[PDB]
Design a protein that fits this description.
The structure is a homodimer. With 430 residues, chain A is an alpha/beta fold. The first copy, chain A, contains 14 helices and 16 strands. The first copy, chain A, folds into three domains: 64 residues, Arc Repressor Mutant, subunit A (Orthogonal Bundle), CATH 1.10.10.10; 219 residues, 3-Layer(aba) Sandwich (Aspartate Aminotransferase, domain 2); 103 residues, Aspartate Aminotransferase, domain 1. Chain A is elongated, with a radius of gyration of 31 Å. Chains A and B meet through helix 3, helix 4, helix 6, helix 9 and helix 11 of A and helix 3, helix 4, helix 6, helix 9 and helix 11 of B. The structure holds a DNA duplex (48 and 47 nucleotides). Chain B: Its cofactor is pyridoxal 5'-phosphate.
Chain lengths: 430, 435
DNA sequence: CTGACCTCATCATTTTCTTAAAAACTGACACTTACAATGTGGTCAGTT
DNA sequence: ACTGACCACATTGTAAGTGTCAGTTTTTAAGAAAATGATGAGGTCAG
């Protein structure tokens, strides 16, 4: 349109430099007559010119020029089963929670989180895992990484962190960028080496009391009490609790969280919420002791929330009624059936493939007694359009001589387990 | 036996309390299965299950073909934010259709996460929209996504280093100083005239990265001329380890004179990084954002943070991709622009009558206006009187480190006030004041 | 030999799951009004 | 005489609105089947 055509035509002229600074623009009220355009279009074009500072106008009209110069299957514990997700149950609550009548939920607020969401999480934790909490005690954010970065900023750059050697490669990745340094630790079949911790001047150590990734070892009560006494020995040491994959134990009901024994408020409860409902929904949560929570509130008062308020409201409406328990039970049953079927199928190769670990969880890890190296196993698996993930990446120490490979089955359909196992074993040469 | 918890639980609790109180010592022999089952008239299965759970917990240890052994030794009416958007005008009925379209039973294999840099789609449509609406020239793979501006700025801070010195605008939007208060880096305060940032103070100082808004200046609304933009670009080009960050506040809400092209459009030496937002246009509570980086910084970010995961859910990403794929975003933006223009004209016409004691500083474009109060009363008195009428207001003192003008000037917002309540709110706040 | 490891049988209560009809929803097509964009024309007050 | 901005009413094409409709969908008191905790009676193997 001429509204912008004239503006561009004069902009290219002022840019190329046929007119210098101080020269008047060709005319006013005369260029419209000479170019047979109306005066309004010229006025609008000149207003556009002076808006961006290409030409500046004296309050009495003068014009001053300015410019002058392909995998069939995959196996790993991250995936969860997606077919059995009740979409028709999520959609109902979504349509119930977001309506034109219920406005003013489109604007941000409650930097920590929605009060109802926090209260319901506290109630659920207290009545399920035996974790004493307070509605204002718990904080909620998107992703565990953000919460751990907030923790790192809150504690400082003058601390050393304890990480078990075979475990989840997350704290190492976070501490690589930060100035802090970590100390490796070995683990036996009963838990972490509490003796090594107590004979060392570590400050904060990271562990999963409920289930040990990936071996599934469960800490006994004597080691737990010894660790609490070690934390009580000093005044400025803290223990972080990781709620990786609880509520998924079949035979032996559920084991209470370590915080239940925390009489002297010295445990912070890290958790997770995206390894149950949706892997890509990005909600996590964390509980802190009263003094540390108070200091965090008094220190991080400016940051806004990280997870959308719509998701908070729809999910607290979803699991306020009680569908969370039903979905959890159905997932537990189907995963138990999958585990039993996989174990029964793989039991016949007991002489060469020995299963090690415990039933509870979403994955199993098996040692291969064949003479091929772990690289050969991975290459042959990926050559059959079914890639597998070795355990060597989960520990930074020297490679274990028997090639130990982790296997997951969350993503594999129930009817394709036999075919996947058969083709994997055929690729391995059995 | 009458409790809802089966004997599978009462027996375990009883042995729990017996062990904890110390009635059974270390290594003491348990009565095994048959003896206890006969003594307590309970089936072998429940007793063996309770003992197996006990062994799993670790209180006692079982050895094959022999008995157990213990191993346990001991009110506001009209809120005034220059940050809200109008809520009633939001087309919820259009959001619902896309949400029901994207999340269905057949739409499996999407709950699992992935593509930490964002799905190729959302990136490609956001790049297309940026190129065709703001003159931003960038390949789709360069843009990144995140939950809000805070996470992106923290990632940029970690990627750059702890030695750089950051430059901010005049006393104003208090974000970068709040972020840098927790980091070893330091900020250099600056001053701006009624046109923009003073490039002379930039070139007489050795600052490395300076934060500015080349489109609209918070809160004065000043727009940088081409000469100052070219001078800043030349200063950035002068050295080899200095960068300029661009933050477009409301660059798509210019009423009369179309849209002002972005500063990145004039960049040729790959020296600017774009910082946009999706929380001041569509919904201020979904927490979406984006950032554009040049090729070397893109490679550095890809090779440095390759082992992260996006903080934005794929449901929202896909529904936004569907929303902006068919063009409803432009229609919604036009509707919001028109309603905000009408609101601004109405409020300006209403406030024109009281002009002797009050003045308007900001320009037409934007969502807020700043006005001075020449009445003989201090800023705290204005704030307290406003709050006493159940409608509190926000002064510029919080935005100002120093004291600029002795007559207090207050920022007023109208994004979250209905058209039928503007006159009533203005009348009641004026009555609360001396007028 | 008594003693402790196990794996079938089939009983039971109470949650989960499935199909029927009757209910409300909303989609595409259509059309009737409206509406604010650019745009031409004719002014307006005030400088110097 | 040279030049500020402020009406008039003309235009094309996007946005807004009501209509009935076929259509995918929501809701429900039945129905039946699954699973656990539970009793009973075995199985091998040590020492």
């Amino acid at each position: 349109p001429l509204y912008e055509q004239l503006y561009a035509h004069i902009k290219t002229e002022i840019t190329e430099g046929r007119i210098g600074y101080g020269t008047k623009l060709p005319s006013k009220r005369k260029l419209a007559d000479s170019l047979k355009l109306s005066q309004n279009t010229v006025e609008a074009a000149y207003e556009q010119l002076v808006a961006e500072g290409y030409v500046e106008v004296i309050p009495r009209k003068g014009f001053y020029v300015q410019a002058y110069e392909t995998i069939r299957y995959n196996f790993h514990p991250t995936h969860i089963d997606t077919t059995s997700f009740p979409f028709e149950q999520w959609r109902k609550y979504f349509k119930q929670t977001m309506c034109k009548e219920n406005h003013r939920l489109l604007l941000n607020g409650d930097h920590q989180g929605e009060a109802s969401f926090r209260r319901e999480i506290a109630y659920y934790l207290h009545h399920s895992r035996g974790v004493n909490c307070t509605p204002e005690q718990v904080v909620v954010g998107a992703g565990v990484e953000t919460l751990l970065q907030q923790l790192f900023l809150l504690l400082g750059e003058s601390k050393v962190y304890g990480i078990e050697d075979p475990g989840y490669q997350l704290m190492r990745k976070l501490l690589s960028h930060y100035p802090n340094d970590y100390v490796p630790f070995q683990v036996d079949e009963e838990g972490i080496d509490v003796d090594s911790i107590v004979r060392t001047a570590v400050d904060v150590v990271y562990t999963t009391p409920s289930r040990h990734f990936p071996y599934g070892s469960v800490l006994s009560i004597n080691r737990r009490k010894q660790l609490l006494h070690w934390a009580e020995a000093h005044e400025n040491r803290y223990i972080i609790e990781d709620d990786y994959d609880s509520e998924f134990r079949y035979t032996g009901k559920t084991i209470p969280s370590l915080q239940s024994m925390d009489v002297h408020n010295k445990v912070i409860y890290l958790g997770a919420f995206s390894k149950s409902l949706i892997p890509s929904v990005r909600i996590s949560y964390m509980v802190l002791p009263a003094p540390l929570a108070h200091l965090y509130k008094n220190k991080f008062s400016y940051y806004h929330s990280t997870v959308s308020r719509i998701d908070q409201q729809v999910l607290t409406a979803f699991m306020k009624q009680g569908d969370f328990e039903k979905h959890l039970n159905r997932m537990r049953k189907i995963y138990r059936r999958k585990l039993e079927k996989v174990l029964s199928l793989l039991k016949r190769y007991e002489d060469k493939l020995l299963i090690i670990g415990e039933r509870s969880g979403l994955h199993i890890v098996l040692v291969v007694k064949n003479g091929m190296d772990e690289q050969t196993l991975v290459e042959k698996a990926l050559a059959a359009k079914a890639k597998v993930y070795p355990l060597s990446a989960y520990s930074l120490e020297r490679a274990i001589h028997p090639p130990q490979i982790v296997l997951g089955f969350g993503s594999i359909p129930e009817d394709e387990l036999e075919e996947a196992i058969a083709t994997v074993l055929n690729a391995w040469g059995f």
